[PDB]
């Protein structure tokens, strides 16, 4: 995929270089210290020089015994980009295409992703050079457990050191094996041993709302910009999801959830694309009907309430285009043909920097992956917090909140019944059907959804304010990288460098 | 060929030789194909470096500017903990260089029975471009980054100085570790070797590699079996030698061989060479190089045009640089013994020519392990928290005096009142040993015992696998046999 | 007879504690009344008697066929007056909490008599190793180590296990490897968590011969003492001494080899299935080679087949080097031997001990004689703490001093007499030359064991004279051990 | 009482055996893995066999000095039924009727009691074989503190390892002494040292509503 593409490693480096030169001049004049103007330039440029490269990169070579008895030496890597926030955070990829450069580029990208959504972790990324399709579940458990042991001994796993997560190639059963190995061996004496890894099953300390997390983040990211009338009038559109049409490229976990949440708020799905074929219906595509067909047949091709679209969904006449497939699909060759006004990156690096130039020229707003694709990172922070807390969210306050709500309604009821007397009869103040469902179904997922919504709302306004401060307009990607570099710089500047 | 490819090829050669003997020596409840897989599978685990750490740490120059420094540290094996290996400060350091030297250290430790796995660090800077204050900052910060990732610790990884590093850097590494993360460790100062005496260093560290080169040559030169093959007499009597590279190793090797009767005919250096068939005094040459900076212009020696490698002598000691003896100059070497007092001075293609010409090459794996041996003793000294002999020198002296007094009192009874008093007193040489009894004596003997024991192990391995004068292959087979045994008997976790 | 070995050890302690009690009160110099001193002494002895900690385990294992099995395990730590605790691991379906507790308590007193600074401990995994593959036994050993480590029942400074007749050096190696790579990863002494390890894993040279050499040195110290030998109507030394060994195992073979080396003649060797006898003498090397090629000593060409047990053989020294409770009150009045050297734990019942005292038959107890292996396990533990083999830095130094000593005698004599009849070469003997050339760690371990057995024999002899026990060496050994364990408690005090 | 009755230990074992055979067949078909049907039966039955017994049982023999000066050796036990959830949780009983079987049965009962109310702790139970009526408040402090020390050294007390609690024979003051000994000795460097034991007074870190807790639970 494009997270394994060498062109994507150069892209993330270029995004940092662009943002660092923009933020540089403002960081010098904002610095109030006993230094000359050339001493201030060296301090700013020098800290940004520290931020750019990966602080640590560990290369491993560990043994494994196959189920047939033969031995195999496995290659592995883990890069920790920055420790200005500890622990480090980042997924583990099981692919024969993993490399040191890939692991370093994705580690750097996680530093700036966390920074835009105010998630207090440094960037990190691991890669085990194996094809999981070639191994038994028993062999994959041995690889996972041995890899965890090698990381733990060298400080590349730990609740306060480095917290890995699953990728597209790894799942919740892998994360469970990592947590179990750690809590049983090196982290045995640690009360927060299970906070060493996120993406764990519910039985092992995983948060509710992890599966929907990236899709809800894509929804909230779009929602924050679509409701802003300032940006929408620039794109020649009305604010809100009313009379909005959208197309999703990639019907995976992110694609399905993004389609479900936008449809729930009034938007109409015009076309859904996939690796093998595309589907299109201008009248509308129901996400629940499409989900049931995809689960029963394996593919969206052949959906009864949609015609087969010949080609990519990227050029469908819609308002919002959501690339939910991790591929450099929007390039300079197809950017002048995109009929959408908003491009919502629900995957890492779906648009090339040359296409970005064309979208800016065409007044097409691209909400960047750095912000929009940070919903899963946000709830991984909540999972890490849940494990530190050793309690599910709301466990001690759902009933308390429910009683206070009933007291507030009974107070309005008595107050009014007193004002109008017994002649005006009883005035029953009861919860709505929707509020009654919320009270009865009150669980942890309700708080994880709220924390994610608050994070996406707060970060959208930060990116909007950074865009106005540096006069970037519709260049939201540059605003996001400048926002992230500004935050990382501030930690280094106020903490200082030891020795 | 690259030195990193060379050490890999040495391992591959030794692993295929030892493989068949490791299968039949294995007594377990397995089929013959299950035994082949177990041996080949364990050999596959040993060959690559287990861990490699790449660093990028900040530094603030004395002028105020910031600089990001690159650094690496490879831990080739942990079959023996801690890992051991030097730190190089050079702009020419690389991951491959650090990996090759880490693997080489694994096998080098194994041949001299030093219980450490191999390791090697490299900081990509030119020390000539930095002040002593800047070098202290780089050293302290590098130590902190290694410490947080398990690449320095008394029981984890013990670094050492290199040609680009000194005892003052080691002192800063030990102080940084003991004052920050290793504060709660009683053995914190055993985290690094090569330290000054005031910081917990062993006496005899400076002479260690030179003494090892001497003892390595001494063990083979005094073996009549090998010497008759080379058409030579055993011992250093009537032996002529030439040293290439007049550094710390070159100076000490020349001094110790001369002390035992060997005559130095030629001394080579980076810029020029010196030659005198009548003999070159090591003390006179040492004083001239310390007063002038170079050996060129030595009054009791003519200026030799070219490398010392082709001088008509018996023992050639390349005590400096990598790949000096190559396939192009090997058919012109007049020496019958090539004592490698540096890492990788002869290419594998030159090794083939030396075997064809019946020229015995004592390998770097064994001969250049004197410094590694006393670094083990320094690590032990720090764990002991006492200098060697501190509580037994006086006790030993009094026991010696009682022994001589017993011989005297017994002989005076046998010869009674006619042979008067028969004073049994120590010789002048023994009296000097008693009076000058210090730690250095125990380190020197501990190193001599290691070189003697390891020479016999290599000789026995050479006879077992019928290698003859191929001592390098014997040394790698000896090391692979030892590392394999640790893995086979311990097992692999998970 | 057949008393429970657990009850035996308890009775030995009770006997020794009541003997030492009166002497411990008058030796106590403190600001207390005489009844306060009696309570303090009796109170400390009440603390020493029972096991301080006993851990019962139930851990999972996955068989090679895929099925799961829950394994039972135990480990008792009798005392922590000396840390770490020390004690073997038994893999047998016959292990029990009482067995593990009795052997742990026995180990405390065994260590105390040989001045080995460890408290007593003993583990037992309730499995029959014959029913498991080498892979399954690895899993059991590694998992058992993990469960002990997490609860403080393994560690270089907490508890150091060792092999038993049912476990070996490969299991010890797996224990060390599991500890060094999981819980004890950050510990510099992680390989000192277990003893009985192979040489490649940090084992001492001389471990295999250790118990046999200890049996030899134990007998040697009493056999050379003319005071004790005249009581038994015998001459001092191994000259004209005949001996018989019950059980031809590791202890039996080595004890037979070392006694024969010093002049003693082996008249009979017994085994689980049959016995061998030759009054002219049995060569230990010839018997060892036949036992390694056939499996059993039955059919040895230079020995007739003896019908019955070797305990009733006409010899001077009887050595029960195998089995428990072999000498009972029913066969004690028929022992023609005059010295019974216990090469195994609990081979004679307390009722047989009474008969041997009545018959003036000296029994050297297991508490002392069977402590050779414990002594070198202490040296292995120290070797791993030292991180160096014994003599590594001093063999060459010692060798040079020896040359200088002989050269000083030669040069001093050459000055006194001159070269009238030539030079007077003072060179080493053939035996000294062999010692110099073969100088290795095993020589220092053998010396350390010999010094320990010599020192402890004199301590037991002095205790026997102090309390007028005579030939009751077992009571002398338990009184010696209780006196030492009490002293540690009395001078340290009890926390809270 | 009923918690010391041998018939109750057999009772709990039977409840587990009944539940394990009922849940067994449904656990095999719900398992979606790359295994044969006999490999799935062994995996389900093997896990059930692991759950049933107590993982660890520690037996103690610790000294105590009575107020009159005499010494006494106290017997004690602590079983940790399961560590699928850490820390373990369970009360401490001070009774001459405590036994290894009682401590094992109540530890196992605790595991299932915690799982039904989604409390993330494994089962545990301790018993000190003494009659508190025979000891002074000073002697009971010594017993409590020394028992705490013996459990702490062997991993049978700690906020992330095992968190004891009171029962009908122990109180909040004993819990307060347990926390105080742990915080001032073994857990001195632990920021959550006072979380090693529950049932503590309010001044020592106890929750409000502990006294009414069982009664409100019965009501709800
Ligand atoms: N990954 C990060 N790197 C740098 N700064 C960060 C990071 N995450 C958050 N910050 C910043 O650090 C500060 C944390 O303050 P706080 O109010 O506690 O956080 P928040 O309100 O974002 O949860 C904020 O200024 C926030 O923007
Ligand atoms: N670096 C090493 N790797 C593997 N085996 C080693 C290493 N160093 C020593 N050994 C071997 O381990 C064993 C250690 O046993 P010991 O007698 O204590 O050591 P030594 O006599 O060499 O000091 C010997 O067989 C020795 O050859
Ligand atoms: N296991 C033990 N239990 C109690 N006391 C012991 C034990 N081992 C040794 N001692 C005693 O402790 C003291 C240790 O003193 P030290 O002279 O250092 O020992 P040693 O000379 O026996 O090596 C001696 O009195 C010794 O007899
Ligand atoms: N003691 C326990 N043993 C096993 N599973 C438990 C235990 N306590 C809780 N669980 C389960 O573990 C999961 C924990 O998920 P989470 O939602 O964080 O917990 P909860 O909502 O119960 O507070 C739930 O499935 C819960 O039923
Ligand atoms: C932001 C800080 C954690 C940076 C740290 N002080 C350093 O020296 O790199
Ligand atoms: C020789 C041992 C240190 C090997 C170790 N068990 C490993 O898995 O690497
Ligand atoms: C001898 C000491 C280790 C005794 C210890 N103070 C205890 O209370 O058991
Ligand atoms: K950085
Ligand atoms: K390796
Ligand atoms: K005790
Ligand atoms: K259990």
Author numbering:
A (entry chain F): 62 to 560
B (entry chain C): 67 to 560
C (entry chain A): 65 to 560
D (entry chain E): 62 to 281
What does the paper say about this structure?
Glutamate dehydrogenase (GDH) plays a key role in the metabolism of glutamate, an important compound at a cross-road of carbon and nitrogen metabolism and a relevant neurotransmitter. Nevertheless, with an exception of the family of large 180 kDa GDH, most of the NAD- or NADP-specific GDH are homologous to mammalian GDH. Mammalian GDH is one of the first allosteric enzymes discovered; its allosteric inhibition by GTP and activation by ADP have been known for more than half-a-century, but the structures of respective complexes have been characterized only recently. The activation of mammalian GDH by L-leucine and some other hydrophobic amino acids has also been long known, yet no structure of the mammalian GDH with leucine has been obtained to date.
For the first time, we report a mammalian GDH structure in a ternary complex with the activators leucine and ADP, co-crystallized with potassium ion, resolved to 2.45 Å. Leucine binds at the contact area between the three different subunits, involving those from the opposite trimers forming the GDH hexamer. While the R207B guanidinium group makes a salt bridge with the leucine carboxyl group, the D241E carboxyl group from another subunit binds the leucine amino group, which in turn interacts also with the hydroxyl group of T559D located at the C-terminal end of the third subunit. The ensuing conformation of the aromatic side chain of F560D, which moves ~ 4 Å down upon the leucine binding, involves F560D in stacking interactions with the equivalent F560A of the subunit A of the opposite GDH trimer. Stabilizing subunit interactions forming a trimer and between the two trimers, leucine may thus transduce signals not only within, but also between the trimeric protomers of GDH. The K+ binding site is located at the end of the α-helix which ends with P114 and is formed by the main chain carbonyl atoms of I111, I112, P114 and H142 and the carboxamide oxygen of N116. As a result, the newly identified binding of K+ may stabilize the open conformation of the enzyme in the ternary GDH·ADP·Leu complex, transducing signals between the ADP and leucine sites.
